Amino acid sequence: EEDASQLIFPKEFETAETLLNSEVHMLLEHRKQQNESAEDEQELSEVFMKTLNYTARFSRFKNRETIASVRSLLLQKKLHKFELACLANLCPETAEESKALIPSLEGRFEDEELQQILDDIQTKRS
Amino acid sequence: MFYHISLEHEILLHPRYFGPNLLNTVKQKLFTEVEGTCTGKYGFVIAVTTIDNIGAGVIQPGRGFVLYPVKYKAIVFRPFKGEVVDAVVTQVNKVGLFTEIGPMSCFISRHSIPSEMEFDPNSNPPCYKTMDEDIVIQQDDEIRLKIVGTRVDKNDIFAIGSLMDDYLGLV
Amino acid sequence: NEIRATDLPERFQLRSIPVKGAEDDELEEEADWIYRNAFATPTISLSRKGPSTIQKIKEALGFMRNQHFEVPFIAFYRKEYVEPELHINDLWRVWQWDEKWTQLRIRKENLTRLFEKMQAYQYEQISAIRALDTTDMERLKDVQSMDELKDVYNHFLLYYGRDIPKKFGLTPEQFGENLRDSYQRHETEQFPAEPLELAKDTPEAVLEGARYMVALQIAREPLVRQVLRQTFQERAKLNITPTKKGRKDVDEAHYAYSFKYLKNKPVKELRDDQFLKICLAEDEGLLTTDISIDLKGTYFEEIKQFYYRDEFSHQVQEWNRQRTMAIERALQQFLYVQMAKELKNKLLAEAKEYVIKACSRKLYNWLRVAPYRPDQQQGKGIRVLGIAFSSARDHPVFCALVNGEGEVTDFLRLPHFTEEREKKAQDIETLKKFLLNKKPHVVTVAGENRDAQMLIEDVKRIVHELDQGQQLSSIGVELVDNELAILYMNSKKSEAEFRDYPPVLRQAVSLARRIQDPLIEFAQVCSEDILCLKFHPLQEHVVKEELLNALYCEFINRVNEVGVDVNRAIAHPYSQALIQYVCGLGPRKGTHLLKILKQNNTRLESRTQLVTMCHMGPKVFMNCAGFLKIDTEVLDGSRVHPETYEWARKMAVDALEYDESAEDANPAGALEEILENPERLKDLDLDAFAEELERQGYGDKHITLYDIRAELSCRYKDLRTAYRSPNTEEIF
Q1: Domain of B157: which CATH number?
Q2: How far is CA C605 from CA C39, C613, C628, C639, C651, in A?
Q3: Any keyword Phosphoprotein (chain B) (predicted)?
Q4: What does DSSP say about strands B66-77 and C398-403: parallel, antiparallel, or unpaired?
Q5: Whether B68 and B106 share a structural domain
Q6: Does B134 touch chain C (CB under 8 A)?
Q7: Do C113 and B133 touch (CB under 8 A)?
Q8: Domain boundaries, position A14
Q9: What are phi and psi of B145, to 5 degrees?
Q10: Are B86 and B66 members of one domain?
Q11: C149 at B interface, C-beta within 8 A
């Protein structure tokens, strides 16, 4: 019944906050920093390792300010929070690509405004 | 896709852990309990990020354990059907393509794969080149996919990817 | 029906999978590819020379791709086209060279078609620094450098855009010719502009815009892929030094743990040494491994002066700084990652090749048929009495008395041993009661410990001092090891041949079958049954397909050189299923022959039983004429094919001075007198036979004359070794 294709999600996660690749990358790296210091500790699980090394491949950027920048430039518009991360990680090079991948963008915004949001994300990419 | 939430849990603490180490011990127990696990309700809880509070520990009548309810923020990963994600090809076989997504993996049959992406079983590296050998898609190639169906298998998830949508390849 | 009723044989149709046959124009190219690829790191086939090895590879590839010949046929029946008995690996090396040449040709053709299509699209888009279509010919022409062409073709395929509708420093060619020449002949952009002038003509205002394009052009070019390649993989002193946890995690069992302060081991210690490569590959997986050349600090210093400007006045200084920054950006990605990947691939390939060579050597040394026969050769064969005991401690010890024809005759038990703490007469009384009612010919005792050796020695003394070998003779127990009799007893042949017997009777039957017939035990099993025996500790880190192919080729060569009995695979269960490792007849041809001979009552009367009855084809019956042997024509149970029967009969008639009257079966004075002993070898000279074969037969009879003379005089000659009785260290 739930389907991200139509922005329909469980209420317990609709109320939940999506995270970016570079965001969770920084949070996980911060944890790992705490989780390898403070001697007399238990190593992180392999889950944490594979999630780290996954998101490390897909970090568009790294400093918290870059995350805050792409979040702020997105929230000023009228996009739904689900669109916030899928559109912030992939960085589709053209509005046509974003609208083809994301069906909710089709007719959601003028092509030039969606393209501007994309281009801004591109300019934020390290 | 990754998330974080204020979860809550309750631990039963044995009386041996009372005294000065108590609330620290409750924390250590919670980190022992709910890290690195996946749930049929919330999906894959990656870790506790912080503890919102430790509740007042009710002493169980007739058995010495004290029950502490605890509220805590945790990062969590719950894929949904319909989501278009970055992934890395892990294994290319004529039976289908296998690919990893965070804690999870997906699998993509030749049925899901465009007809032009023929099998390359005869090369050393398993690939699905096209007939002119221009778009070379092989293992470990950072290939996009769209999660078209979710499945939970005993506190674990196993989605299924596809390649039917355009622009599902190299960036 | 395609493999059993196909025109080509089974083994040649399986070996030429990627290269389906050999044409005329591709035979020289495939032979050159085999001679150039078969010896790169190790001195292999340097025996035959470069010209002789290349002509042997070309002749074997042409014979196999035009005549339906195989690796066994191209070595025995094609000894003139191949190395005349230089090694058993020449046929396998020639087949690998042909397969690699075929695959490289197919890949180069597909890649050249792709490069031509992309160059045509880029030229049509460019006329209606830009994209040129001249690298497609340079990639499709380099079929030998597969690693250099796969790197430049992908970095070129991404460098043109890869679009499918249907001025920064030096150039890539000049930088490649200066870095690969050891002297940088071309400098960077010698212009008055600086990195601020190039960064305001992208839309970022950053000085690092050109360094990314320079790194992408340097890493995706074939000149850098050739210049970096073979410089470190040909020599890299691997500094082995244990890690923080690896010095305690290995404990001197892996390559990084065995030497904690011993570094400077070059690529020969990894590639030529299989144990060092296996330890460096296995210790690196869990804890850590030490694999580093330490020769770049100087390999990276000499390329920094090339492609940079020599002056510094904001014209040559800006160009030299841009060249140095682009070289530093492209070295860490392209050169660093490429050098690491080449070092890792070379280490893995060297460890896998060492493990595969160890496994092939162990399989060739153990696959030789060395049975103990009567007098080291009443009744055929010898009565193998397989004694496979359990413990020697008052439990039932099996002793299976098998005959010499590959079948068990009788069996007995022995529950009395030296159980009872002091029973000296019980074991000897049981041995006398078991040896007195049964007629053996050989003693095959096993061993498990000191008590098993003591029980075997006591039974051998009670049998030799009492005449328990034949009831009127002392028979010595050859005392072989309990290695193959234990594994063949729990198999499908031991379970189908005896299902009521315990493990002791199955072990005794396995020992009696393995102590007198290792070729029927090796050919009667799946190969699954050959991979259960370990051949080396570094074979487990190697790919198993290489060891399986080496074992299958060694077993096929041993079966082709040792002879295949046609009547022994029809009635006896132990002698059947031997038509799987023969030249030209693999699993399908041999299984169809067994089914047709069992269902129709077709017996092995001669070598033309599969050509006359329509069970075999022309190409497999010609390529299998040197492996099929029968019990009875007179040259059918030998290596003489249908085309060599006339020359062999003429040689047998000329060596005896008999009359020529169409001698094919009647001349018993020249055939039955010549097959029993050497009648006259000075009558048949090699020059006369080679002159008669060059004009009547269409082929030189120089290398074939000795085999034609030996097949007419000793039929069914086995290529297995003699009986090795284990003692001392092999007994332990």
Answers
A1: 2.40.50.140
A2: 45, 11, 11, 15, 23
A3: no
A4: unpaired
A5: no
A6: yes
A7: yes
A8: 5-125
A9: -155, 165
A10: no
A11: no
